[PDB]
Structure 1
Amino acid sequence: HWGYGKHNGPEHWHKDFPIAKGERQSPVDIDTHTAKYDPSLKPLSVSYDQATSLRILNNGHAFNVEFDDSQDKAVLKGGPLDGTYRLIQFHFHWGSLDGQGSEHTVDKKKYAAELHLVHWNTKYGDFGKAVQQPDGLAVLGIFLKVGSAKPGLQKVVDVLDSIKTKGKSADFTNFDPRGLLPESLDYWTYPGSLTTPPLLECVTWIVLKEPISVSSEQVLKFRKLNFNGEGEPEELMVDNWRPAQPLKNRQIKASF
């Protein structure tokens, strides 16, 4: 089954998921000199004050912080988006070393990690129908660099002990994702896909320019996580990132 290793990694995904060679695949390199400032972009609106987190799951490829999306609380609108997209989960992609980890790159620069807060277009009723639509999803991408600790990430850090192997989950209520946002909402945007199989080409990507700083000790604990399930030999959850894919004539816009 799909993973990030030699025998099942991103170079193999196309066999089960043909769309891997598709026309709007993600992530991509953000060539900052070719992206164009777009005057028609409305200001971004990230409203996470009412967010209702439920749990945290090791799914054998990343961990998911999942939210109650049965009502219009944590919502993303504005920017390149039409209408409202509700927050369903977030997860990270991260490296084995600080020089790699992010999925999107900026002028070929890799960050230590990347956070994706995943949202679905509420005109489609739920997530399931949302991923059958070219505008079904909006993902806010945020870079991580190793630096000063990020106070609003330590509560996820602290819980990782409890979900070390594939298929474990713990309760994770009252988590405030506002604690993960850099100061500036300047971003690049382009149409793309999810970066894990099934790689569905349903995503409006909104990639923040300003990275968050996280401490080495915080990112170390990410890398103590396991891809294997309990009582299987240890494979560290590291390098769970897909590399940049062909742009194929899509245009990246800057909000700034």
Structure 2
Amino acid sequence: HHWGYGKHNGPEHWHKDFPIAKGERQSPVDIDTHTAKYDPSLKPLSVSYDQATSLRILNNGHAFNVEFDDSQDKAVLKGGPLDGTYRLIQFHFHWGSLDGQGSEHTVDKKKYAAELHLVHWNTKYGDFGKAVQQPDGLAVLGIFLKVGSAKPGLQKVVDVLDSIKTKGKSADFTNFDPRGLLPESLDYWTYPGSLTTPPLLECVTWIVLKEPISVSSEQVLKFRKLNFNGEGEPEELMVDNWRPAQPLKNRQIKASFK
């Protein structure tokens, strides 16, 4: 009886195995645009993905992960609110059963159809397992998806999903360029928070981009054909794999932009 996204194992149950679920810096949150203060001390985000080396795509039973070679400083996030250098390890998405839900963060209570998370770890801790034990261990870049025009840079991901339909399936996924998933603007909000899946550790600097990317109805429908279940098990469509907004508590959301 492991955690998941259902009635009997979804987010309102997670606190029983992971008591930090009711902690002081949980994610995601609602971004109240009127309350988020412009911080002129924040730097432009530096996204250096030119040498990013994707290796593989994996259906982990909750989402799909696109994994990178993080054995050197290839793909790195720095600047913005960050001190030092954060290495790209993977990205994944959260999405809904319908276009009106799917994102984890909300913007004035608006839910987007999906949310992309690019996960990076602080190189000062040496390995991601040490980094997740630190309050400044991870930086996650969050990007909203809305349904409209197709995202050409996403289609290589969409086209491999048929080969990882079920939990535990992986596929070689080399030479994927994550620059193709970024919007035009790097304007962002930032706040201190947590992983949004168990173990829910409070180790993340969140950087949420204001400008969403557009994907087509056909692209997001292919996300919704994935399965939470393993091969030869009863079909449970991989949809609504998002945690709802959590209490902001004693935190300030900062804007990089006026």
Distance 1:101 1:176 in 2: 24
Q: Once superposed, which parts of structure 1, at least 4 consecutive aligned residues long, lie more than 6 Å away? A: none
Distance 2:46 2:98 in 1: 33
| 1:215 corresponding residue in structure 2 | 216
| 1:161 corresponding residue in structure 2 | 162
Residue 39 of structure 1 deviates from its aligned partner by 1.1
Superimposed CA distance per residue, residues 53-88 of structure 1 (whole angstroms, 9 cap, x where no aligned partner): 000000000000000000001100000000000000
Distance 2:212 2:169 in 1: 30
3-state DSSP of counterpart to 2:158: helix
Residue 188 of structure 1 deviates from its aligned partner by 0.2
Residue 176 of structure 1 deviates from its aligned partner by 0.1
Distance 2:132 2:204 in 1: 9
Distance 1:215 1:42 in 2: 32
| 2:153 corresponding residue in structure 1 | 152
Which runs of 5 or more structure 2 residues have no equivalent in the other structure? none
Superimposed CA distance per residue, residues 111-159 of structure 1 (whole angstroms, 9 cap, x where no aligned partner): 0000000000000001010001000000000000000000000000000
3-state DSSP of counterpart to 1:26: coil
Once the two structures are superposed, the pairs formed by residues 216-255 of structure 1 within 5 Å of their partners are 216-255=217-256
Distance 1:59 1:200 in 2: 19
State how many pairs are aligned: 256
| 1:112 corresponding residue in structure 2 | 113
Distance 2:238 2:43 in 1: 38
Structure 1 length-normalised TM: 1.00
| 1:141 corresponding residue in structure 2 | 142
Residue 42 of structure 1 deviates from its aligned partner by 1.3
Distance 1:186 1:194 in 2: 22
Residue 72 (structure 1) aligned with residue 73 (structure 2)? yes
Once the two structures are superposed, the pairs formed by residues 32-111 of structure 1 within 5 Å of their partners are 32-111=33-112
Residue 168 of structure 1 deviates from its aligned partner by 0.2
3-state DSSP of counterpart to 2:161: helix
Identity %: 100
Distance 1:194 1:214 in 2: 25
Which runs of 5 or more structure 1 residues have no equivalent in the other structure? none
Residue 216 of structure 1 deviates from its aligned partner by 0.1
